[PDB]
Amino acid sequence: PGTVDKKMVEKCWKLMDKVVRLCQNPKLALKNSPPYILDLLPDTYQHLRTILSRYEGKMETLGENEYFRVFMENLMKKTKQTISLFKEGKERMYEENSQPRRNLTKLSLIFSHMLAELKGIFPSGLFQGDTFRITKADAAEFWRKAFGEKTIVPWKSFRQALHEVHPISSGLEAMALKSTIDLTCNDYISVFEFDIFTRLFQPWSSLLRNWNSLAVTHPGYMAFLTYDEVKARLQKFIHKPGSYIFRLSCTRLGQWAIGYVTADGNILQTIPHNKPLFQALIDGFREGFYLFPDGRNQNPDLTGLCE
Amino acid sequence: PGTVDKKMVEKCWKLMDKVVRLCQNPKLALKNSPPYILDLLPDTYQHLRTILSRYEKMETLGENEYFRVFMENLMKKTKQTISLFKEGKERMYEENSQPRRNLTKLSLIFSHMLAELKGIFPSGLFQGDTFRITKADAAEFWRKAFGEKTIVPWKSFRQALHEVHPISSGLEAMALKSTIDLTCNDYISVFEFDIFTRLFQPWSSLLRNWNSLAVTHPGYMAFLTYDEVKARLQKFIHKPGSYIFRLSCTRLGQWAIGYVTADGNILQTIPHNKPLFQALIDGFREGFYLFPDGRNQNPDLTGLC
Amino acid sequence: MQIFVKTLTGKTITLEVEPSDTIENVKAKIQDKEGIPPDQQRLIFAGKQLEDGRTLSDYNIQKESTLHLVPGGSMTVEEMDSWIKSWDQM
Amino acid sequence: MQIFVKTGKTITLEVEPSDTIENVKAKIQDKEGIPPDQQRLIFAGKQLEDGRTLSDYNIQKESTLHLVLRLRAAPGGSMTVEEMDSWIKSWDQMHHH
Ligand SMILES: [Ca+2]
Ligand SMILES: [Ca+2]
């Protein structure tokens, strides 16, 4: 990760504008719903302009910060990816079912995550990474013992430190995990990505079992969806009361949301109330609300995850 | 439960006829693919006719325990279908409707019932007491628990299985029953047991295999036709390595797989002389079976080895 | 014999049952007619919640009887749904 | 540094001698879409290993590597993939009435 200066920021800014102009092609018909790249990139620009404003006169201090160097490096790469995606994709960028368009959708989520991370670490344009409050006490004590006040660590270091407390059984399991926790796809784990992951897959004591049971082996899991997409997905099961799905929100990272079909033909969305998601799923099945994940007749029994 | 005289077979035939007539409604627009209730009910009539002619004593055939249970379920299931149409009214002609969904479910059950009857009466002659369970370890369990029996009540089966493969809760037992009780009659026949232990082999990890394939695997699609497998994967035609796996109502006890190739084709195959989960492990390692139902995360079934 | 079940919307539904039918069988009949999952159903008759394992003649429920079909600081379900919807405001 | 890989339509990728063999198969995926695990890459009579780097194989600029798609196991007497697919399709044939 190389030192950042004004020239690099100006470079990234021009690359972001070209991605914007590419995404303004009317042949794209980009949906006005999150993640919305036409807002995210201008918002990333405006937040970077704010950070620089805070560090005017101490620009040497901002440019050596490890988190910031890794971030700008990743921002440049992801914009170059997107430009190249349009170049290689040609007319297929305008068929939604295409590999290129699906990859644009993936990159729009990544830009959303990067902006949320950057605002988490630079709340008002000031670096606060070394004082980031990790939400779950057990997870916070893990990060402090292993990494102290560090804001970001290489993936290999994170994997090694995690393995000591939660063994990772195989390189296969390791790459599946990295895919879930490395939200910004930069081969680092920030304290922010760690906070999100451990909020989603609490309690810490069974972290990887929670993650496998919810993100890998559960057919009701839908990854990132909007509110509207939850309704559209359940619409085919509108007359099967008890059909349900659960999903992530790119506007509220670290939060789970649930959608379910009522007995009277309505789709409602809710969150787990003061309890891990798997407990809400266990309770919802027993109470007759969450019976058929994505409409399916068989439902994972998460009861084994309780202690 | 009760004995089966000729009058009862004639009642069932008449109920089947009324189901056939209800399902001949043009407004239904029944899909021409299995399970096809308009073939399955006449085929069921015909095999029953065949059975009756093998026994021209009818006292003997009417006392047979499996045949008593089968005929009771046939009468129950056809009456259920008839009520479904009367209760469902015009909703029967809307595909997303609970009535129509239930008709689809019943069409599969009639398919399973005919397959089972033909399995127990292969040439119209009762052969349940000599039925050959395919997997050796499964057969030894059935013989030690049930001897030469062809059919046992669910409670008896659950209790015998729990002695060998503990069932942890009432919830897990009800989920298991939903998978193995194909004909939905609260009994387990030796035929249903054969199908289940073929699908969820090896016996040494039976319930773990069942949970990992039919409950907690998003690639599992339960019963689909070949055409329906292509339709499901069409969304992911440009995502090589997307795959699903499924059951065939025409070939019970057989797994089939569909996957997207690197060149935009959808191919269908079966596990080659190996449990389904080993084919899934191998297919992931070789780059063919990467994205179950297009999902980025793929269950790792290695722990089952 | 027939009995009646009054739902929360003021709807009276008519079931055909037997005195030996369990409360679980009744809820299954209600699902058949109304689509309500049995675990979402609570039945009340003559001041008592009806238990799943017990029968109709256990509760002395006769022909043409009528049964009734039925967190602090929390959001209502509608308020919760509206809130989640607003997460996606642009 | 640059190099070429050959459908028969030779493609061009930009890499340094320090990038690993896994990354080369990734750059192929950005252009051909093939998943990396199905990709087999030959360089002068041998199939390179996903571990050893480009400098670890003496790959020089303007060189060429042949791309061969890995195939599903073809044990003796197996059906071909098309025969297997046609068989499964015929499971659903019907003669009505
Ligand atoms: Ca990261
Ligand atoms: Ca059965």
Side-chain angles (χ1 to χ4, degrees), chain B residues 116 180-189 192:
Chain B
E116 187 198 65
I180 185 166
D181 185 7
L182 290 176
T183 62
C184 295
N185 62 2
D186 299 322
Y187 288 83
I188 303 304
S189 70
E192 282 163 326

Side-chain angles (χ1 to χ4, degrees), chain D residues 5 8 17 26 28-30 33 35-36 38-39 41 44-45 51 57 73-94:
Chain D
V5 181
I28 300 176
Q29 188 176 18
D30 295 341
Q38 308 184 31
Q39 299 183 24
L41 291 168
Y57 271 118
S78 291
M79 317 177 66
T80 73
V81 299
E82 300 86 355
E83 294 162 359
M84 170 68 63
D85 183 82
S86 301
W87 173 46
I88 294 171
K89 179 181 195 176
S90 69
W91 300 351
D92 297 336
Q93 295 181 358
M94 292 175 307

Side-chain angles (χ1 to χ4, degrees), chain A residues 95 97-99 169-170 172-173 176-177 179-180 211-212 215-222 233 235-236 238-241 285 293-294 296-301 303, chain B residues 94 96-97 101 168-169 171-172 175-176 178-179 210-211 214-221 232 234-235 237-240 284 293 295-300 302:
Chain A
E95 287 142 28
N97 64 280
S98 69
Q99 180 173 101
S169 48
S170 59
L172 190 158
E173 187 187 27
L177 171 67
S179 160
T180 295
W211 160 72
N212 186 72
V216 183
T217 60
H218 206 303
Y221 171 67
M222 293 296 137
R233 179 84 178 209
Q235 197 67 225
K236 57 176 299 193
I238 191 64
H239 300 115
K240 191 178 196 177
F285 182 78
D294 198 27
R296 308 178 167 218
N297 286 315
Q298 311 290 326
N299 188 51
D301 177 25
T303 299
Chain B
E94 292 161 6
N96 76 322
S97 79
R101 169 173 78 260
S168 60
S169 62
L171 189 161
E172 177 182 324
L176 174 60
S178 172
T179 302
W210 161 68
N211 184 71
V215 181
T216 59
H217 201 305
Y220 172 70
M221 301 285 127
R232 179 82 178 210
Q234 190 63 32
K235 186 182 183 188
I237 187 74
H238 293 125
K239 184 183 205 183
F284 180 83
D293 199 27
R295 293 150 87 107
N296 286 326
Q297 300 285 4
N298 190 47
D300 175 26
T302 288

Side-chain angles (χ1 to χ4, degrees), chain A residues 1-5 8-9 12-13 15-17 19-20 22-26 28-30 32-48 50-55 57 59 61-68 70-86 88-89 92-95 97-101 103-105 107-132 134-140 142-143 146-149 151-159 161-306:
Chain A
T3 177
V4 194
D5 50 37
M8 176 171 192
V9 191
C12 289
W13 282 352
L15 290 180
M16 292 164 65
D17 278 329
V19 171
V20 169
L22 290 171
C23 293
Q24 289 175 320
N25 187 0
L28 276 187
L30 268 193
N32 184 32
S33 63
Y36 190 52
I37 211 173
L38 295 178
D39 290 339
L40 293 172
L41 294 185
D43 291 349
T44 299
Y45 160 85
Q46 293 290 349
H47 198 62
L48 292 166
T50 296
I51 297 180
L52 294 182
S53 183
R54 305 300 179 255
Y55 286 87
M59 203 56 64
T61 304
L62 180 70
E64 288 168 347
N65 174 274
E66 171 158 21
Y67 170 81
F68 193 59
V70 163
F71 176 94
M72 291 304 295
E73 182 187 351
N74 195 46
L75 175 58
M76 193 200 65
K77 285 175 46 181
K78 295 286 183 294
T79 58
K80 289 184 180 180
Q81 287 194 229
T82 311
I83 297 160
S84 164
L85 185 68
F86 277 81
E88 309 293 287
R92 287 148 41 243
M93 194 56 63
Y94 323 119
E95 287 142 28
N97 64 280
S98 69
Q99 180 173 101
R101 186 61 171 274
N103 279 323
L104 182 58
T105 299
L107 289 165
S108 300
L109 278 166
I110 286 169
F111 284 121
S112 190
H113 304 334
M114 301 173 76
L115 175 67
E117 186 192 68
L118 179 76
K119 293 180 143 156
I121 303 301
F122 289 80
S124 296
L126 209 157
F127 181 65
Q128 311 261 37
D130 49 28
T131 43
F132 189 93
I134 291 175
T135 299
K136 302 306 291 178
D138 281 340
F142 166 83
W143 190 277
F147 307 123
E149 290 186 320
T151 294
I152 193 168
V153 308
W155 163 250
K156 184 168 67 73
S157 294
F158 180 80
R159 181 198 163 160
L162 188 56
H163 184 69
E164 295 294 305
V165 304
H166 293 296
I168 300 175
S169 48
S170 59
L172 190 158
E173 187 187 27
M175 292 306 301
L177 171 67
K178 185 183 176 300
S179 160
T180 295
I181 188 176
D182 186 6
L183 295 168
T184 67
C185 293
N186 62 8
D187 304 319
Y188 286 75
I189 305 301
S190 68
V191 72
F192 177 88
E193 294 161 317
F194 176 78
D195 180 61
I196 299 296
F197 188 84
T198 54
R199 287 170 62 199
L200 296 172
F201 301 108
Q202 61 180 285
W204 174 260
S205 53
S206 56
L207 183 71
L208 296 186
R209 294 172 55 219
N210 306 330
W211 160 72
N212 186 72
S213 285
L214 291 169
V216 183
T217 60
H218 206 303
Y221 171 67
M222 293 296 137
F224 282 98
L225 297 176
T226 64
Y227 174 96
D228 285 343
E229 291 162 348
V230 164
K231 289 191 306 178
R233 179 84 178 209
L234 284 174
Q235 197 67 225
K236 57 176 299 193
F237 300 112
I238 191 64
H239 300 115
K240 191 178 196 177
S243 303
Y244 77 104
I245 55 196
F246 58 95
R247 54 89 175 196
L248 301 170
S249 171
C250 65
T251 56
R252 302 290 190 269
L253 289 177
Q255 178 63 55
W256 290 110
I258 302 167
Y260 64 101
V261 173
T262 72
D264 61 13
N266 193 15
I267 294 159
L268 286 171
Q269 297 184 53
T270 181
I271 65 171
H273 187 249
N274 298 326
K275 74 184 60 184
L277 171 64
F278 69 83
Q279 193 60 56
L281 297 182
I282 292 166
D283 299 338
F285 182 78
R286 189 199 339 112
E287 296 174 337
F289 291 115
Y290 306 155
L291 305 174
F292 309 119
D294 198 27
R296 308 178 167 218
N297 286 315
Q298 311 290 326
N299 188 51
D301 177 25
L302 302 183
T303 299
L305 296 176
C306 302

